[PDB]
Amino acid sequence: MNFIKDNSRALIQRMGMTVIKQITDDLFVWNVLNREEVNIICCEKVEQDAARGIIHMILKKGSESCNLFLKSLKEWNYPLFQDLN
Amino acid sequence: MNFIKDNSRALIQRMGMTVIKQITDDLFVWNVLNREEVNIICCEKVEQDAARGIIHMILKKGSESCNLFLKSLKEWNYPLFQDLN
Amino acid sequence: MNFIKDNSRALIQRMGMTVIKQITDDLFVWNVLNREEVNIICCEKVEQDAARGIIHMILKKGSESCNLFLKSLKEWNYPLFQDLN
Amino acid sequence: MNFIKDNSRALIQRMGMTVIKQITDDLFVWNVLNREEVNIICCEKVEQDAARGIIHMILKKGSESCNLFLKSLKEWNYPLFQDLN
Amino acid sequence: MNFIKDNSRALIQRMGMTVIKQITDDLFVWNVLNREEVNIICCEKVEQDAARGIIHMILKKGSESCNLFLKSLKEWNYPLFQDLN
Amino acid sequence: MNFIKDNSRALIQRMGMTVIKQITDDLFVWNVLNREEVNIICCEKVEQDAARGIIHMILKKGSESCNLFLKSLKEWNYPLFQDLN
Amino acid sequence: MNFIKDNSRALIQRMGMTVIKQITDDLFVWNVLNREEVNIICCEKVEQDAARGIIHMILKKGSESCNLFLKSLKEWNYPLFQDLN
Amino acid sequence: MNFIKDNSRALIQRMGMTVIKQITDDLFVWNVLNREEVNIICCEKVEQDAARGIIHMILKKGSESCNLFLKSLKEWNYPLFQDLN
Amino acid sequence: MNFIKDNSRALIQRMGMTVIKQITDDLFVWNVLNREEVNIICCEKVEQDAARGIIHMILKKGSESCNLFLKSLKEWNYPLFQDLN
Amino acid sequence: MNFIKDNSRALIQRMGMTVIKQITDDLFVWNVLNREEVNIICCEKVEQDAARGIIHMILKKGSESCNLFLKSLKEWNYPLFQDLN
Amino acid sequence: MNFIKDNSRALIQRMGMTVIKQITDDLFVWNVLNREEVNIICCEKVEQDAARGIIHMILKKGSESCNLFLKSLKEWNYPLFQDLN
Amino acid sequence: MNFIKDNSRALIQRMGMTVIKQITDDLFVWNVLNREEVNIICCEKVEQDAARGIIHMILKKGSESCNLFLKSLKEWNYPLFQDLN
Known part of the structure; x- marks a missing residue:
């Protein structure tokens, strides 16, 4: 996912x-x-x-493992995910 | 095994x-x-x-040693093996 | 001792x-x-x-050092040793 | 870039x-x-x-990669960059 | 390929x-x-x-093996290939 | 020994x-x-x-030195010896 | 074989x-x-x-020894043999 | 000393x-x-x-240097020396 | 200094x-x-x-650097230095 | 420079x-x-x-390159240079 | 060129x-x-x-090939070329 | 010197x-x-x-160069020189 790379x-x-x-x-x-x-x-x-x-170990596990990380990132610590858009 | 060579x-x-x-x-x-x-x-x-x-030392030990490596590779770190197909 | 090797x-x-x-x-x-x-x-x-x-340094010290490890393994953390049989 | 070489x-x-x-x-x-x-x-x-x-791997990658290194060096650890001039 | 020889x-x-x-x-x-x-x-x-x-072993393997080396050279370490033009 | 020559x-x-x-x-x-x-x-x-x-220096030392090499070859790196038959 | 002489x-x-x-x-x-x-x-x-x-010692050993050399030359270092036709 | 050679x-x-x-x-x-x-x-x-x-550099330094190695080998890591007899 | 060598x-x-x-x-x-x-x-x-x-890097720096090490060794952890005499 | 040769x-x-x-x-x-x-x-x-x-590659580069080596040797690791006089 | 001969x-x-x-x-x-x-x-x-x-193969290749050798000798390892004048 | 020849x-x-x-x-x-x-x-x-x-190049350089070699041989690796007498 590019969204993780560009904001890492x-x-x-x-x-x-x-x-x-x-x-x-x-x-x-x-x-x-x-x-x-x-x-x-x-x-x-x-x-x-x-x-x-975590960031370096998720970019290795394909792209399907990015979406799960993104959901689990918007559940806990939502203000950061909303701020980053 | 060709599957290891082509994805190495x-x-x-x-x-x-x-x-x-x-x-x-x-x-x-x-x-x-x-x-x-x-x-x-x-x-x-x-x-x-x-x-x-590991990859270079398994391609030397025939082809029967490839299947064991593939099983032990699909047990641990399964998302990579499933992603690679 | 084979018992350590087979369950390592x-x-x-x-x-x-x-x-x-x-x-x-x-x-x-x-x-x-x-x-x-x-x-x-x-x-x-x-x-x-x-x-x-520990496992790699006991298989090097002969076989008499295996029995002591097994006793000291069945004294503390007994449920694992009993479960493994 | 000469600035990196002279102060390396x-x-x-x-x-x-x-x-x-x-x-x-x-x-x-x-x-x-x-x-x-x-x-x-x-x-x-x-x-x-x-x-x-880092210093030896940046002097090999042309001169355009020096300016980025200099900016990223003046953002973090600014007192050193300001002291070196 | 002349491009490799002239910049070797x-x-x-x-x-x-x-x-x-x-x-x-x-x-x-x-x-x-x-x-x-x-x-x-x-x-x-x-x-x-x-x-x-590598450079001496590719100039021996014809010219068709030069293009593959050039692509694989522009994938990894791109700033050098872009700087050399 | 012919077995070494034919598989060398x-x-x-x-x-x-x-x-x-x-x-x-x-x-x-x-x-x-x-x-x-x-x-x-x-x-x-x-x-x-x-x-x-090694292969060229054992075929020179008669044929009795071949058997020792074969045993010492089937002790360590057994899968190769078993695969070669 | 003429193919070896003409491209030697x-x-x-x-x-x-x-x-x-x-x-x-x-x-x-x-x-x-x-x-x-x-x-x-x-x-x-x-x-x-x-x-x-090698080239001078194969042209002396008849013509049947040329074919074996050509096969063993097209197995290893194939791009040269394919490029030379 | 033969004891080192035979058990090396x-x-x-x-x-x-x-x-x-x-x-x-x-x-x-x-x-x-x-x-x-x-x-x-x-x-x-x-x-x-x-x-x-170590083993190859002690067999070169005469036989008097073997005894010191054996004592210093039976002080630390005694179970190996006792097991080897 | 011999005192360091003999007790090292x-x-x-x-x-x-x-x-x-x-x-x-x-x-x-x-x-x-x-x-x-x-x-x-x-x-x-x-x-x-x-x-x-430390012990190997002090025996290289002459003998004047031994005395300072001995004083700084008898200030902190005095019972060891007093026991070793 | 004789000082390097005599103390090398x-x-x-x-x-x-x-x-x-x-x-x-x-x-x-x-x-x-x-x-x-x-x-x-x-x-x-x-x-x-x-x-x-280093010592063999400096004695080849004339005598003017000896003085620089001596200064850079008396800046870092001064006790050796002071001990050697 | 005489400069190479006299200092060879x-x-x-x-x-x-x-x-x-x-x-x-x-x-x-x-x-x-x-x-x-x-x-x-x-x-x-x-x-x-x-x-x-190199020295014996350059004095054979005319005199125009000497100047290139001298430039390529003053680019790398300059202190020798400057010392020799 | 005969001592070198007889023990060479x-x-x-x-x-x-x-x-x-x-x-x-x-x-x-x-x-x-x-x-x-x-x-x-x-x-x-x-x-x-x-x-x-070394042994063949010292027996050529007279006999005075033998004593220096013997001293430099008894300084480093003394147990060999003491064992050989």
């Missing part, structure tokens, strides 16, 4: 860890990620690094 | 180390690889190089 | 760090490991990597 | 990793670098080595 | 190994090179020597 | 250096080779050349 | 050593050459000299 | 780097090795290669 | 990282080390490796 | 890679070395070999 | 291979040398021998 | 390259060898060949 400069800045901890779960429910990638992402200290791991 | 341009890009660490184990269980090749593959830094070592 | 696919998944921190000590008491290997294993972040280091 | 003695000293992690992203957005060079640069330990890789 | 003074200087590792793959997919030439080229240390081996 | 086209292709490093040792234990031939074989870069040196 | 001006130029190392093997399997001629050809430095020795 | 098949497999890092020091104290050989051995990645360098 | 077997074991972090600073104040060596030593995980880097 | 026995021993990485840069700024010699020197593993390459 | 005692000593690898290329661009002479010169081990081949 | 059977076996790299330097300091012989000896792969070149 701002996505690694104003996202927040507290919403990452939820997006990773909603992704784990839909059988996109296994447990090891959650244990690797969720253990980092600075949330910007987790943003790097 | 994309397999060395969107694979990921975290799933390689499991594929190498599932291969080690079935007596395909010995320990030294695991110690050689698992010590590299960039995951693309590990993808090169 | 599941041992690197459902083990847990909190029991590794005890198994390493019970091994350190019986003069199997020295301190440097404990400092190397206990400093890793993801517990699966510690499981890899 | 000081650019590999007072730069810092935390700003490199942003410069690499702002470069990745503008289709200058691909992902593999980011995975190679961002994995090094000492920030001076990352400064060597 | 600059192609062995500002190319980089990280893009060679991809060009060799995209060439290996199209049945141009076999595995042994990849094992000979990819094992050299200084990237300039790999540039010598 | 495929033995110099799908063998691998990592198993050569063990076969040379298992040969060195049984007083077949001295150290200088190990220092000559183990220093080459491309594994195919080491395959040439 | 270009065969001693764009052939390459890396394919000679395979053609000599595929010839040695079919009991065409003995080992001493392989030890004579494979020890030369410039690949053009090996091309001279 | 197993010594290059189940030794481990973590004990090599200590054996090299205990050897460096007794003026057996100088610093350059320590810098050559300690920089390798796979521990099996370090085992090769 | 025990200095790389019972030293500790928490005192290394202070010795490196007290050395940096007296213009013995520059910043890059501090960034190289302080980034290692196991404290024994830092002990190796 | 000790300069290839107690120098260190960490200061070589800076001397090569300060030399690269003053248009003494080009990039290829830096890529050749900086890629070696053991620092003693880099000391050999 | 010093040109075969302080030149270096790393600059020869570039001078041969800059000569190959201007249609002075063909590929076979580059394959003959570039394959020698000691750089002094390459200096002998 | 064992000197070409248990010497090692790592000490040759120092003996050649200590010889170069005392104006015994020039640089070209160092470039000839130090470029060989198998250390036994370097032992052949």
Whole structure:
């Protein structure tokens, strides 16, 4: 998805860890990620690094995994998604 | 197997180390690889190089070792395998 | 011991760090490991990597070091050992 | 660009990793670098080595890629760029 | 092809190994090179020597193999190809 | 032995250096080779050349030295030996 | 065979050593050459000299040995053989 | 010493780097090795290669240097030495 | 200094990282080390490796740099220095 | 310069890679070395070999290039230069 | 040209291979040398021998080919050319 | 000197390259060898060949050059020299 690439400069800045901890779960429910990638992402200290791991690990998993991330991104932390349009 | 050769341009890009660490184990269980090749593959830094070592070391071990790699590739990181068809 | 090899696919998944921190000590008491290997294993972040280091470092120390690991594995975290049979 | 060459003695000293992690992203957005060079640069330990890789990999990519690096260097870590003139 | 010959003074200087590792793959997919030439080229240390081996091994394989190299050179490391015109 | 000659086209292709490093040792234990031939074989870069040196240096040492090579070849890297029959 | 004679001006130029190392093997399997001629050809430095020795040593061994050389030349380094027609 | 030669098949497999890092020091104290050989051995990645360098560099330094290696081998990693008898 | 060499077997074991972090600073104040060596030593995980880097980097800087290290070693972590005599 | 020749026995021993990485840069700024010699020197593993390459490549570039090396050697790692007088 | 003859005692000593690898290329661009002479010169081990081949093969190719060699010698490795006047 | 001749059977076996790299330097300091012989000896792969070149090149340079070689042989790698008496 181009929408993630073009705004990934701002996505690694104003996202927040507290919403990452939820997006990773909603992704784990839909059988996109296994447990090891959650244990690797969720253990980092600075949330910007987790943003790097998630953004870089979703652009690798085709384009169908982008839509799920976008819905799970507009459910939690909606003001950012509405602000970015 | 032709399926690996024809898609090996994309397999060395969107694979990921975290799933390689499991594929190498599932291969080690079935007596395909010995320990030294695991110690050689698992010590590299960039995951693309590990993808090169695995892809280049499976095309050498006949064609029966391809099917096991394909099963262990469709168990972990299924969205890539489903996307590639 | 074959019992570790045949189930090492599941041992690197459902083990847990909190029991590794005890198994390493019970091994350190019986003069199997020295301190440097404990400092190397206990400093890793993801517990699966510690499981890899322990499982790969016990299959190297003969077969007598397997029984001690099995006893220290059935004392703490007994439901896993009972479930695996 | 001569400005980078003449001050590259000081650019590999007072730069810092935390700003490199942003410069690499702002470069990745503008289709200058691909992902593999980011995975190679961002994995090094000492920030001076990352400064060597970036400075040596930009002087090779013509002169138009120097101006973008200079803008992305004057946005983040402005006091260094203002101090160097 | 004359375009490679006339600019091969600059192609062995500002190319980089990280893009060679991809060009060799995209060439290996199209049945141009076999595995042994990849094992000979990819094992050299200084990237300039790999540039010598590739540039000297493509001018020998007719002119039809030049176009594929040029496309695979404008996909990865595009700023160099655009700068060289 | 005819079995080595008739399949030596495929033995110099799908063998691998990592198993050569063990076969040379298992040969060195049984007083077949001295150290200088190990220092000559183990220093080459491309594994195919080491395959040439070993295959060409065993057909010279009678036929009794073939059986040891075959056993040491079916212990490590068994899938190749089983595939070749 | 006239096809080798008429194009031997270009065969001693764009052939390459890396394919000679395979053609000599595929010839040695079919009991065409003995080992001493392989030890004579494979020890030369410039690949053009090996091309001279091989091309001059095949035109002497009748015409039936030309067809095998042509097949082994169209298996490895096919783009040259297809380009030369 | 024959004891090292006859069991060097197993010594290059189940030794481990973590004990090599200590054996090299205990050897460096007794003026057996100088610093350059320590810098050559300690920089390798796979521990099996370090085992090769140490085992091959001790069989060259007479037989008196074997006893020190055996004592320093039975102090650290004692279960291996006791298992090997 | 001979005192460091003769006890370097025990200095790389019972030293500790928490005192290394202070010795490196007290050395940096007296213009013995520059910043890059501090960034190289302080980034290692196991404290024994830092002990190796410091002990091996002081025996290279003459003998006058030994006395400062000994004073800075008897200020912090005094019981070890008093125990070693 | 005689001062380098007469002390080159000790300069290839107690120098260190960490200061070589800076001397090569300060030399690269003053248009003494080009990039290829830096890529050749900086890629070696053991620092003693880099000391050999630098010391042997400076005694070839006249005597005016010795003074610059001496200044850049007395700026970083001053205690060695002061100890050697 | 007399300038090469009178100083060829010093040109075969302080030149270096790393600059020869570039001078041969800059000569190959201007249609002075063909590929076979580059394959003959570039394959020698000691750089002094390459200096002998180049210096002896340029004094044979008239005097117009000397000026190009002098320019390509003053572009790379300038301190030698400036020192020799 | 007879001592070198009578033990040169064992000197070409248990010497090692790592000490040759120092003996050649200590010889170069005392104006015994020039640089070209160092470039000839130090470029060989198998250390036994370097032992052949050094041992055969010292028996030619009178007998006074033997004592220097013997001292430089008893400084580095002392256990061999003490074992050989």
